[PDB]
Symmetry: C3
């Protein structure tokens, strides 16, 4: 239901109900939560890559039969990952499927992938963080339209809006996604984690508080081995070798 | 001063001081407030459509006319509508005229319509929610330029920035706007209303609080007839028929 | 280390360690703070223009040179300037160099200028307000990519993202920047200042609080000579002449 697989410091997670377009059930949420918590705790894992099996990323909640609490746990786990997350959207992302996709720090879609909010078509509001992420990602103007009218957006339109950072031919998506994940897995994991904490908080903070948090987290980044390594690397005009500590 | 008219669940409100380009006065604000309160309370109204009479949408505050509290009341009523609002910008929107236009959830402009913040040219700051809406809609970088330099944007540029969602020839604007409003008036009114409550709050909330509010409001959407209808519709591969409750 | 120079109500500040690409040291920060405080207090100054000497704007923290409180003081002073700030990016802006550049209310880059977040390359998080400004300026999607991958962006890409408002040939940059600064120096300084206070706060405020602050600050703008002048100018179809009070 969630396939796992490690590779050069990258934990690859695959949503696996392909015949139902990876539609989301309680069980899948429970398994997804577990994989994410495992990936967080495993120190050998320095990057995650999330994708779907088959033709789709995920068509969202399975409309074949508490549940809210389950989604929320996954989102707290996705958002709080102290490790870069790459998302490879290999096909349709609808409803909470789109929500999950959008939690990637770096996001790639296949030519032929698509995105639809879908919630409103079922008389529901956006969940799994979409009301949070979407206006931040594409701006309020596009958020309003995408949410209220629920159009189906193509990969190329998703790229233009900032829903994804790169579009790639289907057969190359995993190769590029994994290649990016591997590179991130070599990079300064602590700097990544703390930069993400700043981005997650930025909009609700006053400048004063933003400056204070930057100070505190810069303080911590400053005492990592990776920063020592980083400065040394720059001085001795060579690439750094980061360990994530 | 504010024309009203119902049609298939849509309340159409027209700013009507056309010879003064629908420039805004205390009286017009008072009439607008009343129409909006009525529209909110009327259960047979499932969508609103706001437009201007004549050449212009609105040239903003009438410069030939405490008072700020009056604008604010109208904005609380505009923004808090528990019903999709369509805006059809039939000509120039300047100052609080632009503020009002931008409160549409879905916004259409006529080909020769135009937008100017105007405020700074009169030595004023933005009002009527523009300092709120604009940076959210188009991002801080464009907000700074639009506000501090007050250029005049065309319909096509407004479309590119997300200030409007669709551009249409003048003579077709009302037909398309009303047609959109009628379609929204058939859709899940509660889902629309609650989505808007989430969008209004999103930027000041931490992820944790955002997830909590999504849960509460999803809880309520979940107990509407429209959601039952929504799920049933998907199962029995047919279009849903929503009532807004 | 910081060159100063007045001209038609514009204070021009130049970062001057050109041989080290205007890399930032404690001393430079202290000198920059002083110049900014002076510019703030001088009533004859109605605009600032910040630039770099030589090939670069600033390559960020000098890696040859807790300390965060020093940067923060400068940022509080930059952000709280009650006067439009123009920034002319004449060459590379990296790390806190990019942070400082982005505090411009209006920003110009030379053809040939470039931008790099840089922080993550040395295993650090963004500072000097970049985690605050960047997501606001270009949206969260681009912020994620710019910060985590630290690409070097060209002037034209920076323009497309909103990092700068205008790109100009190198030999004309100062002429255009100063010309813009001079125009702003003739405009309604108080309206500028108060608009900036609204923009700085907007994201963490509820609509209700945003409307209240607009009322309070509009109240103040309303009692300036410049507003009287502004209204008078519109009535007597002529350009206003503003004094900034
Ligand atoms: C765009 C998409 C996802 C894909 O369309 P196509 O590419 O055209 O494929 P298809 O629809 O033709 O069908 C593929 C098969 O998979 C099935 N399927 C495709 N989604 C589903 C599905 N969500 N369920 C069951 N079978 C499905 C579908 O029934 C089909 O089986 P069958 O036709 O053989 O019976 C399409 O099916 C669609 O528009 N909607 C379905 C997805 C959808 O609306 N999800 C929103 C659910 S709400 C949500 O995200 C979160 C949520 C959170 C919390 C609390 C409460 C409620 O909701
Ligand atoms: C671009 C626009 C809107 C229209 O351009 P044109 O198509 O060129 O028309 P026009 O300028 O030639 O004027 C047409 C007629 O309507 C009148 N009008 C055209 N705006 C106006 C107008 N805001 N007032 C009166 N008559 C007007 C104008 O004087 C003319 O009347 P007349 O020919 O009967 O003399 C133009 O009038 C303009 O540049 N500026 C007016 C916009 C403006 O400054 N709005 C107020 C900004 S501040 C705000 O919104 C709210 C506010 C609220 C509360 C408290 C304090 C302060 O502010
Ligand atoms: C893209 C850029 C800026 C430009 O590269 P190029 O155009 O290829 O020129 P270049 O690298 O050859 O530089 C020319 C000279 O200036 C020197 N320089 C050029 N930046 C520097 C420099 N940041 N430092 C010393 N010498 C430099 C550099 O060593 C060179 O001298 P050399 O001939 O002795 O090698 C490149 O240097 C780059 O990717 N990164 C350098 C900038 C950088 O890493 N900034 C880190 C900012 S960290 C921050 O903002 C705040 C901070 C706050 C608090 C506490 C701890 C740490 O950090």
């Amino acid at each position: 239901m969630i396939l796992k697989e490690r590779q050069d410091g990258v934990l690859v997670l695959t949503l696996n109900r392909p015949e139902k377009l990876n539609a989301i059930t309680g069980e899948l949420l429970d398994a997804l939560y577990a994989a994410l918590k495992e990936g967080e705790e495993d120190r050998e894992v320095r990057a995650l890559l999330l994708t779907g099996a088959g033709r789709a990323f995920s068509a969202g909640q399975d409309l074949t039969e508490a549940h809210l609490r389950r989604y929320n746990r996954v989102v707290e786990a996705l958002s709080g990952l102290e490790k870069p997350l790459v998302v490879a959207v290999n096909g349709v992302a609808a409803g909470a499927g789109m929500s999950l996709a959008l939690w990637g720090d770096l996001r790639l879609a296949a030519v032929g992938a698509s995105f639809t909010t879908a919630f409103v078509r079922i008389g529901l509001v956006p969940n799994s963080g979409l009301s949070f992420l979407l206006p931040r990602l594409v701006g309020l103007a596009k958020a309003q339209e995408l949410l209220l009218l629920s159009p189906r957006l193509s990969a190329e339109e998703a790229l233009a809006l900032g829903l994804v950072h790169r579009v790639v031919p289907a057969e190359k998506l995993m190769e590029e996604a994994l290649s990016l994940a591997k590179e991130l897995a070599q990079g300064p994991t602590r700097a990544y984690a703390l930069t993400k904490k700043l981005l997650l908080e930025t909009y609700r903070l006053s400048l004063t508080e933003a400056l204070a948090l930057e100070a505190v987290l810069q303080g911590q980044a400053g005492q990592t081995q990776d920063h020592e390594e980083g400065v040394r690397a720059f001085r001795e005009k060579r690439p750094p070798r980061f360990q994530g500590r």
